Structures are given as C-alpha cells and as structure tokens.
C-alpha cells in the first residue's frame, strides 16, 4: 500500500527505546504471545485478533505501565502513538483493518434518519422488511 515498511521501523525504533528497561525486569521465560495468536492472525478472525491486541496494549498494557514506572512513561507513550498511527494507515488501506472500518452507507443513512427527526423513526420501522431482505440477500452471498 502506502508506506508501511517505515511504519514498522518506527514502531521497532520506538521499542528499542524501552527494550532494555523491560527485558531486564522480566525474569520468567515462558511465551505470553503463543503461536496460537499467530494462527488467529492467519485466520478469518485475523482482523479482529489484531484489533483486540492493539486495543489490549493501548488500553491495558501500556497505560498500566506508564502509571507503574514513570521513568519510561514518556517512552512508553511515544511507542503507543506509533501504534495508533500504524492503526490508522492499516484501515486506510482496506485489505488490512476492515473490521474497524465503519460502513459509509450506514453513516449516510443514520444522517438522513436524524434529518427526519421524529418522521424518521416511522420511516426506519416501516422499512424494516426492506432491512430483513438485505440481511437475507447478504447471507445468500455466503
């Protein structure tokens, strides 16, 4: 796609900034990120696995860290941004992060619905049959 090789190196370089801090503190030697995770990544549940993992680090792992060891707080943060950044480019290149891509048709419609205010709730409900049909059609494409 665009510039993903550099996005990786950025992420990596940001990591080398805190690599020695952490790998010196982790005295257990079992693998947390089992190959199993790699498999999901290779499977249809791949997109969701990758999103859950990015979310995991960004919401659980990193924050908890920055607020456990201030020394590298800014460094942990710099890495986190490199991750958010990489996330954007991924869904901006379809193929990679679609499961985080919100349908444009749905947005337009939700707008039209709100621009109809109370008249909209009836229009929506009245076209529910049309909805089931699309649902139905969709399935067919499987």
């Amino acid at each position: 796609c665009d510039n993903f090789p550099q996005m990786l190196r950025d992420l990596r370089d940001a990591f080398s900034r805190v690599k020695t801090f952490f790998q010196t503190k982790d005295e257990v030697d079992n693998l947390l990120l089992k190959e199993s995770l790699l498999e999901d990544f290779k499977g249809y549940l791949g997109c969701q696995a990758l999103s859950e993992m990015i979310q995991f680090y960004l919401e659980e792992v990193m924050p908890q860290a920055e607020n456990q060891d201030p020394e590298i707080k800014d460094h942990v943060n710099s890495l986190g941004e490199n991750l958010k950044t990489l996330r954007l480019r991924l869904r901006r290149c379809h193929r990679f992060l679609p499961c985080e891509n919100k349908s444009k048709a749905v947005e337009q419609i939700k707008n039209a619905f709100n621009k109809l205010q109370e008249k909209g709730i009836y229009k929506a409900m009245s076209e529910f049959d049309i909805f089931i049909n699309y649902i139905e059609a969709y399935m067919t494409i499987k």
Partner: protein, 202 residues
C-alpha cells in the same frame, strides 16, 4: 574473597548465522579460571549448558541457535568457574532475536560495461545456515543498500548513494581511473544496524 565474582556483562554480537556470545572477564582472574555458557530458548523454562568450561571471552553459539530466524529468540548466560567454586550467572540484558543481528553483505562485484559500472551485491552465504534458510528467504522485502564510492588515485573521500536492489549502476564521467566501493545493507522495515563491506575496486 569468599565466593567467585560474576562476569560483569554478557551480550551477543551476531551477523547472519554467526551468533557469537561475548562477556567481560571477572577481576583478578587466575589462569585456572574459565566460563560456563548456557542457552535458553524463549518459550521453554529450562536452561542448557553449552560449554562446561571456556578459557575465552566469547563463544560461537551459532550451532545451537540455528532457529533464530524462525523463533522468538534466546537468552544466554555465563558464570565463571575455578576449581569447585563458581559465580552467580550473568544473563544477557535483552532476549537475543533477529533484531540484534547486524546485517552484512557477502561481497560485491564490479563490472565495466557500456559507459558505467555495474554493481552486484552478493548476500551472506554462511556455511552452517540451513539449506532453505537463505538471506533473501529471511529478509524477503525492503532490502536496501547504502553505497560508498571512492576514486583512486585521489584523496580519501566518498560519494554516498542509496539503492533498493542487489544490483546498482553508477554512470561514469570518464576522467576517473580506478573506483572502489563498499556497501551497507539494511531492511527498510527493521532497525538492524548494518556492517560496511570491505573495499572493492576495479
């Protein structure tokens, strides 16, 4: 003193399939003292002694780290031993993985053509590297090269050029007699350091 001291530091210095472990000697080291090197594969809580005794300050762990490029790396450690006594283990600060491998090129070929020089970058073909495990195989994309050219006769100055392939072309101005080149490989996606190559002239 009571117990024997530990190696101050233990770290790796590797090229493509040239995984050498290194360490700094303990102070006041007697001749009769040596070191025990042990290996840990990440994902398996269990160390393995590789050398019971080594009267050196380094060890070639390649034979036992042949899976580096398909694994999650290793942990290496050393402890001094003298007689029946030994020191604490000193493990490497970080986990050894492909990230700590210093990129290098096998060699460089220079050809005289139409009105230019053609360079062919030959990647490292270490003898112990598994048959299937090739450099291009491990690093399949984004292999780039920083190129240094020096004219001769002439002072010791170089022209820097950047190439995206194992083959590059340098137009000739004519007037220059001999040219010498050196190459520095990298991988756009990785931050691995790279080793400048040895002078190569026509």
């Amino acid at each position: 003193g009571t117990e024997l001291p530990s190696p101050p530091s233990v770290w790796f210095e590797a090229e493509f399939f040239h995984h050498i472990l290194h360490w700094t000697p303990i102070p006041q080291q007697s001749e009769s003292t040596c070191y025990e090197v042990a290996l840990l594969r990440y994902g398996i809580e269990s160390w393995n002694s590789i050398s019971q005794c080594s009267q050196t300050l380094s060890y070639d762990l390649t034979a036992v780290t042949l899976d580096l490029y398909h694994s999650n790396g290793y942990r290496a450690r050393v402890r001094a031993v003298d007689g029946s006594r030994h020191s604490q283990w000193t493990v490497t600060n970080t986990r050894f993985s492909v990230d700590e491998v210093t990129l290098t090129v096998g060699s460089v070929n220079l050809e005289i053509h139409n009105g230019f020089i053609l360079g062919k970058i030959q990647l490292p073909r270490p003898k112990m590297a598994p048959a299937q495990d090739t450099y291009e195989s491990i690093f399949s994309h984004f292999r780039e090269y920083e190129i240094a050219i020096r004219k001769v006769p002439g002072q010791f100055t170089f022209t820097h050029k950047k190439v995206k392939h194992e083959q590059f072309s340098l137009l000739t101005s004519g007037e220059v007699g001999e040219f010498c080149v050196q190459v520095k490989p990298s991988v756009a996606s990785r931050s691995n350091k790279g080793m400048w190559s040895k002078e190569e002239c026509i």
